[PDB]
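Reproducibility note. Readers wishing to regenerate the assembly model reported in the main text can use the exact inputs given here. Chain order matters: entities are listed in the order in which they were concatenated for prediction.
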Amino acid sequence: LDKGAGYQALDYFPKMWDQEDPSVEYLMSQGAPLMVPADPNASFLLTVMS
Amino acid sequence: APFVAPNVQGRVIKESGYNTKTFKPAYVKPKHVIDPNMIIPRQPGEALGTG
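Running the prediction on these inputs yields the following structure tokens for the assembly.
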């Protein structure tokens, strides 16, 4: 969701812009991740401790 | 014209001046903000389902 790189879908997007006075750079990387198990039941979790 | 007995001088006739008009043009300044809440949602040409 950024005017940089035409809003296209990317693993991450590194972006950099500067403030004119005082001369401060801002550096931002942004991305829209999600890790989805195709079969959420192909795994299990067992709590063994008290 | 004034009628004036020819034995006397004549009559002095008055005049009038003129006027001026002056105008300043007005000023017009519309604008839009175009944040994502307006860019994202599906526009009419977009196919239903995917887009």
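We highlight two features of this model. Chain A touches chain B through two residues (CB under 8 Å). Chain A has no helices and two strands.
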